[PDB]
Amino acid sequence: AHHHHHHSNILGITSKKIENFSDWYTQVIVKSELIEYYGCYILRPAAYYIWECVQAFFNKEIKKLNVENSYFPLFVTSETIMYSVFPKWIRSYRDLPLKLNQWNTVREFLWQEGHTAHKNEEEAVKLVFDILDLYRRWYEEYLAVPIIKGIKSEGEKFGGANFTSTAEAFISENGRAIQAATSHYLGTNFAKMFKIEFEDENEVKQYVHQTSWGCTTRSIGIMIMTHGDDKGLVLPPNVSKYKVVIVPIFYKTTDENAIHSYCKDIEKILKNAQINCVYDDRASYSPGYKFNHWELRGIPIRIEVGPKDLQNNSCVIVRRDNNEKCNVKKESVLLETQQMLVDIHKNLFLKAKKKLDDSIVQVTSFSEVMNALNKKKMVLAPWCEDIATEEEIKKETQRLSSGAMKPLCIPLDQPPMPPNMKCFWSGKPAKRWCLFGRSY
Ligand SMILES: Cn1nc(C(F)(F)F)c(-c2ccc(F)cc2)c1NC(=O)Nc1ccc(F)cc1
Ligand SMILES: [Cl-]
Ligand SMILES: [Mg+2]
């Protein structure tokens, strides 16, 4: 029977995140046991657990908004056959609002999409932004990922939408923006197509006002790209099944019982407090092997117990995000573990938010744009918002370079627009600031 002292190089991540991002990413998602390639792939329990966590959150919150889950099995190329059925369900204002959500399966295999119909515009638009903030919370509170809320340009919004609001994320390592979630105000467009009308409170016939919104497992990919490091997966505590791994350290059989017993004590303390954890008591693997093994898998906290800790009635607690270590007295393990899990999430989010902030360069002229893109940034630019310019900006940025930059979103949070500020592209008067970047 073989003892494994050293976790071999090949079993760890062999590509650095900064030097080979694409290979780094595929190594992390497979070697961390998130997915298994069969170009389709399987969501193993560690991946599905993340989805199930954000699913539970989102379900709870949309039910407070009276959204009802449902399942519509018929799709067309991808969109759900649905709106043509709405006239069968809506005749008067008493039938409104209609609020539906579906959890679907099908490069991303799972997603959520919601659809609503309202008696007026203001209700529909309120819901669009309520859902958009729920997506902010999905990303921030669970995935520790910062996003930017905004409105898509006319050229990039959904064709059937009056406007498309979006949550935008940014992958700093390769300078790529990514649409993180979307929430559309569809106006009366589909109501006119399918005669989705109702008798209002004044006995006047009206069209319904619709919304739709969705988010996919892309969210998990964004999270991994954000927090992952050269040791592998890094998980916000809220989406890791095990919060803590306990690793026994001993080399003499005379220490085995006391170390094992003490580790079980700590395991009991945590699990009794509803903090799930794993005690890795495998005899065939060294402590050092186990350190690497569980870092690769993204466990937020490691607790080490060796003979020194027995003698000091302590233990060593190591954080996955920054590898900082501290000695903790046994009776303090529960509280310090609770506080550390909170601090790990806060640190993950704040570090990511700083990187997002530093990824945005405010420009006023197109001459500043290429320098920005090559530093893997996106730009915030004053823009006339003329739809014709969108393809012109893309084509030119492609030329001066998949290389092109496109309008990402017009952020809800707008800096002041100086009185005479011109469009960075057309020279025409600028209207608002818009984010532009290379994208997925
Ligand atoms: C397969 N794949 N390949 C890529 C790419 F190669 F393009 F990066 C991406 C991708 C990820 C994030 C992005 F912002 C863009 C693309 C993805 N998707 C992905 O891994 N999803 C996923 C991850 C973990 C999980 F538990 C469930 C689902
Ligand atoms: Cl339809
Ligand atoms: Mg559907």
Side-chain angles (χ1 to χ4, degrees), residues 80-85 194:
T80 307
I81 301 307
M82 181 186 298
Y83 296 164
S84 57
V85 186
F194 298 114

Side-chain angles (χ1 to χ4, degrees), residues 80-90 92-105 107-204 206-267 269-284:
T80 307
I81 301 307
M82 181 186 298
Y83 296 164
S84 57
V85 186
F86 281 9
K88 292 168 170 178
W89 298 339
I90 295 166
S92 96
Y93 68 95
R94 292 174 295 234
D95 298 316
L96 299 171
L98 174 61
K99 294 169 165 177
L100 300 166
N101 179 69
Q102 301 85 45
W103 292 99
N104 290 321
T105 68
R107 197 163 62 181
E108 309 295 343
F109 291 98
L110 309 166
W111 79 101
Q112 160 291 297
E113 63 178 78
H115 302 265
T116 75
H118 304 260
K119 73 185 179 181
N120 61 44
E121 176 169 352
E122 67 194 73
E123 229 179 77
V125 173
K126 178 184 196 298
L127 186 138
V128 164
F129 288 115
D130 286 344
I131 296 296
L132 188 64
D133 196 65
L134 290 184
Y135 289 142
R136 178 197 57 88
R137 295 174 54 192
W138 172 326
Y139 276 93
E140 167 174 352
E141 298 180 358
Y142 289 83
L143 306 182
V145 171
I147 57 85
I148 296 172
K149 293 177 183 179
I151 305 299
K152 296 204 99 62
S153 57
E154 292 303 297
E156 293 281 317
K157 75 165 176 65
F158 172 51
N162 174 285
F163 72 82
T164 292
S165 71
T166 188
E168 295 288 321
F170 195 75
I171 302 311
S172 294
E173 282 75 11
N174 68 350
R176 297 277 169 180
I178 180 120
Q179 199 165 326
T182 53
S183 187
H184 309 277
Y185 172 51
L186 306 175
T188 55
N189 294 323
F190 296 105
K192 290 157 183 178
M193 188 170 178
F194 298 114
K195 293 174 282 174
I196 315 172
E197 307 168 0
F198 68 100
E199 173 171 340
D200 71 17
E201 263 194 272
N202 297 134
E203 302 183 79
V204 175
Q206 310 282 355
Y207 286 121
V208 301
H209 288 254
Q210 287 174 255
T211 80
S212 68
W213 22 276
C215 191
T216 79
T217 49
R218 169 185 282 186
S219 60
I220 306 172
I222 294 170
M223 184 271 287
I224 299 159
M225 286 179 181
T226 297
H227 307 308
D229 63 20
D230 289 344
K231 298 175 193 173
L233 184 65
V234 176
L235 294 170
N238 274 352
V239 295
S240 181
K241 185 182 63 168
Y242 297 137
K243 317 298 182 196
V244 173
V245 55
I246 299 160
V247 178
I249 301 162
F250 63 100
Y251 300 98
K252 298 176 284 191
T253 55
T254 48
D255 288 330
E256 188 176 336
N257 291 344
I259 294 288
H260 180 61
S261 178
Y262 197 97
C263 287
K264 295 299 287 172
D265 292 338
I266 290 178
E267 180 184 17
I269 287 172
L270 293 177
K271 285 182 173 181
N272 282 344
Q274 312 307 127
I275 300 174
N276 203 0
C277 54
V278 52
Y279 169 33
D280 188 348
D281 66 337
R282 293 175 298 169
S284 287

